Amino acid sequence: GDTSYAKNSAYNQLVLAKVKPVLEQCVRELLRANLPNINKCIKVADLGCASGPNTLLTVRDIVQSIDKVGQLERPTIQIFLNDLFPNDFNSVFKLLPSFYRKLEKENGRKIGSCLIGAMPGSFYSRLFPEESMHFLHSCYCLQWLSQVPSGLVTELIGTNKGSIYSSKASRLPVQKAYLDQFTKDFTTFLRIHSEELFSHGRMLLTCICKGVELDARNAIDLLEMAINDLVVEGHLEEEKLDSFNLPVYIPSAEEVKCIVEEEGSFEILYLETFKVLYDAGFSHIKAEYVASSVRAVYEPILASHFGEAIIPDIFHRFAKHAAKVLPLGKGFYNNLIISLAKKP
Amino acid sequence: GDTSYAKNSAYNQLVLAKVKPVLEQCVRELLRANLPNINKCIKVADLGCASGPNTLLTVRDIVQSIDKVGQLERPTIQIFLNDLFPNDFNSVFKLLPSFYRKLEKENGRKIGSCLIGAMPGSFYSRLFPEESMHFLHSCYCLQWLSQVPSGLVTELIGTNKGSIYSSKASRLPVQKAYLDQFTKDFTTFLRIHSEELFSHGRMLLTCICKGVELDARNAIDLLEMAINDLVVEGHLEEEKLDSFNLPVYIPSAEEVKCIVEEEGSFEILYLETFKVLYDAGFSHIKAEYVASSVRAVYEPILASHFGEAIIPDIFHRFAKHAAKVLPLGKGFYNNLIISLAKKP
Ligand SMILES: Nc1ncnc2c1ncn2[C@@H]1O[C@H](CSCC[C@H](N)C(=O)O)[C@@H](O)[C@H]1O
Ligand SMILES: Nc1ncnc2c1ncn2[C@@H]1O[C@H](CSCC[C@H](N)C(=O)O)[C@@H](O)[C@H]1O
Ligand SMILES: O=c1[nH]c(=O)c2ncn([C@H]3O[C@H](CO)[C@@H](O)[C@H]3O)c2[nH]1
Ligand SMILES: O=c1[nH]c(=O)c2ncn([C@H]3O[C@H](CO)[C@@H](O)[C@H]3O)c2[nH]1
Numbered sequence: 001g002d003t004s005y006a007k008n009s010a011y012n013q014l015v016l017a018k019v020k021p022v023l024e025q026c027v028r029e030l031l032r033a034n035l036p037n038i039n040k041c042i043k044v045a046d047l048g049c050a051s052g053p054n055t056l057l058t059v060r061d062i063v064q065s066i067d068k069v070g071q072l073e074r075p076t077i078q079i080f081l082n083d084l085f086p087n088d089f090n091s092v093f094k095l096l097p098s099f100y101r102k103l104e105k106e107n108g109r110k111i112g113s114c115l116i117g118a119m120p121g122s123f124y125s126r127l128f129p130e131e132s133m134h135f136l137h138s139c140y141c142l143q144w145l146s147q148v149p150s151g152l153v154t155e156l157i158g159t160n161k162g163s164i165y166s167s168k169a170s171r172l173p174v175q176k177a178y179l180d181q182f183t184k185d186f187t188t189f190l191r192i193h194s195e196e197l198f199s200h201g202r203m204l205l206t207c208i209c210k211g212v213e214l215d216a217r218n219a220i221d222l223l224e225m226a227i228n229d230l231v232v233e234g235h236l237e238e239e240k241l242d243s244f245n246l247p248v249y250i251p252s253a254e255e256v257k258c259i260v261e262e263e264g265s266f267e268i269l270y271l272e273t274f275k276v277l278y279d280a281g282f283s284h285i286k287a288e289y290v291a292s293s294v295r296a297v298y299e300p301i302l303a304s305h306f307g308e309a310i311i312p313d314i315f316h317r318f319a320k321h322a323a324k325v326l327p328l329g330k331g332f333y334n335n336l337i338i339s340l341a342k343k344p
Numbered sequence: 345g346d347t348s349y350a351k352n353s354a355y356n357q358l359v360l361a362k363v364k365p366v367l368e369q370c371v372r373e374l375l376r377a378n379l380p381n382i383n384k385c386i387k388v389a390d391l392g393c394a395s396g397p398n399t400l401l402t403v404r405d406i407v408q409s410i411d412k413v414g415q416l417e418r419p420t421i422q423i424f425l426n427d428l429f430p431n432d433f434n435s436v437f438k439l440l441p442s443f444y445r446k447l448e449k450e451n452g453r454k455i456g457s458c459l460i461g462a463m464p465g466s467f468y469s470r471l472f473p474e475e476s477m478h479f480l481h482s483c484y485c486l487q488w489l490s491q492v493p494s495g496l497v498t499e500l501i502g503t504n505k506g507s508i509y510s511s512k513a514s515r516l517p518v519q520k521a522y523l524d525q526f527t528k529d530f531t532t533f534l535r536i537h538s539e540e541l542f543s544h545g546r547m548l549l550t551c552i553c554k555g556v557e558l559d560a561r562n563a564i565d566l567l568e569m570a571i572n573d574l575v576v577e578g579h580l581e582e583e584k585l586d587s588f589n590l591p592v593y594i595p596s597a598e599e600v601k602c603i604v605e606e607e608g609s610f611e612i613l614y615l616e617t618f619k620v621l622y623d624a625g626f627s628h629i630k631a632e633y634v635a636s637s638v639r640a641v642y643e644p645i646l647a648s649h650f651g652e653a654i655i656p657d658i659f660h661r662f663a664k665h666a667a668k669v670l671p672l673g674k675g676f677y678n679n680l681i682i683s684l685a686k687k688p
Contacts, residue, residue, distance in 0.1 A: 040473070040474070041473035041474070041476070043473075076473050076474070078472070078473050078476075080461065085437050085438060085440055085441055086437075086438060087437075088434065089433050089434060089437060089462070090432065090433055090434045093429050093430075093431075093433060093462075093464045094429055094430060096429055096464065096465075097429060111469070112469055112470035115463065115470070115471065115472065115473065117424065117461055117462055117463035117464070118433070118461055118462045118463075119459065119461035120437050120440065120461070121440070125455070125456055126456040126459070127459065128422070128459065129384070129385035129387075129420050129422055129459070130384065130385070130420070132385070132422075
């Protein structure tokens, strides 16, 4: 589709390009760590696999990373694609036949040696039997909380005026509520997924993290500005904004690390941050290209609260704010890659 | 949908009713055979899981059979649903949330202790790592061959006149070509799925098998009659019929057993045959109900060779032939259940 996630990735390919060498070194160390039955079958999942061409590009990179180490007879790889229950697994599955052909042709890997299946559900709950997995990988998912912060939901709400998440501009109780939820969720994710890994198993996480720059503007800041424009210009109802809170938290790298250390199950092997500028994969209606990217992510949740009607409007104003920031290199996400090993 | 598989099962529920006590005794013996890590996690697959309410009813029956033995803390069950790449896994996945709630409510099984995933692909090729599974279950799937018999395809065709499969009325070379393909395919299924099972792991297969009765008429015979009606009455081309061969074989119970013994990987623990009359689930346009059941299964393949147009006509004549045979109890499938243990 014209507006779909499948046709509106490609910034994601630049992220994946950064992850790749970390991934390769991560699996290199994991194959020499010699876990149970690893030279026979390696068991792997991707948590938050989504649906487009990008999902099989991650699998491709994971498989290539494992095969690269072969420099004996290739180990079987069993890969589980995880995502929520309503994800479009059907569209991924239909693409499998040609994908497996590509592997045979381009990679030397015989059909049946790479077994790709799905395990749907929340990655804040158990997905796999205790000590069954060698390697878990997640990219661009951990910003999504299990729920709107429970302080804005169970406690007594529309306390986050003019915003849709916790900015640096947000009131103290708003930041606290979002951090508390992140902390709960990430600690649960770490605990739960350590239980699934054999000892010395590994996780590789790539997450959006807080930018340092003053004047920097991420996609959520730009969205927030876009919606504020519509309330100020009479178009949107303005307690509709105050009652809208994304279930998203963008941590700081320091906050991610503290929680890993507090949780206690994982040793941190590697940590790095990197920016990707929103217009980096492009060729200045590059602002419109960015607006389409963000919409492919945020349209469903936005639509269901604000109505299908104002979305064109949201992403028109969005483009205007993007256009101001791109020429300065101020429109980006900052990112964090972290390699963990399960401690014995 | 009105014509869909999901709304056109219920004969299948009678089959499953017959399978259940065999299933139960099968898993009872399996859990005392004490395979590797079986009291911690039991790994199970349903091969040819399809898409309707029936698919989660099989899962339900498998789970209950495992929990029934607990008469210690419930083992985790990891279940893989397998079917072909284009199957509607999406629709099954959307139902999983309520299904898991049902399990917690009605079964005492806490959420996260039953992990249901999918592994798509043909069950005549490898689906799981070697010696990784405890139990595989297949019902009503083994009729379906890997291809139209290679004799009628690679060799030099339109040799099976006025038929669509191998009847007892079929010429000798037709029966030979179909039996050769069954043998190849079923042998491959056994060999391939033994390799996946731990030693002493189990398979339970429920297959359509040949009826004994003269004058008995299964759904395929009735279809064949319906199509023959249309050529004789000028409606259908009549080399369209002679070039149409289903990739379906209905074996005799003796043929299935001989192949199990020859393949040599499995010990046969239990073998039983049973009939289900096509109108058994019904409180005499019961013939129309049967015709709809059969169409839900055979419409895609019929349509793509004969055209979407004549299908109403096919199933109108079908109903007429069904109506002659149901009052006599001559419209049924005969069925075979076989319990198998992987030999050491
Ligand atoms: N709790 C959860 N469990 C599993 N998936 C989740 C989740 N919360 C969010 N997601 C999924 O996370 C995804 C973020 S987009 C996926 C990014 C992708 N891995 C890439 O690198 O390009 C969405 O598909 C969303 O549905
Ligand atoms: N080679 C193969 N691998 C996996 N599934 C197959 C297959 N050949 C046929 N099938 C599937 O087998 C199914 C038969 S209908 C399913 C019957 C179901 N198990 C029940 O008891 O009610 C179809 O869904 C078809 O798509
Ligand atoms: O804010 C988010 N949240 C996501 O899950 C997510 N997944 C991918 N992306 C990126 O989508 C665009 C790439 O086509 C890019 O602008 C990022 O916002 C995301 N941005
Ligand atoms: O010939 C087949 N082949 C099948 O795969 C199959 N799966 C289910 N059935 C049954 O479908 C009807 C039940 O609603 C019943 O008439 C059987 O044909 C099948 N009949």
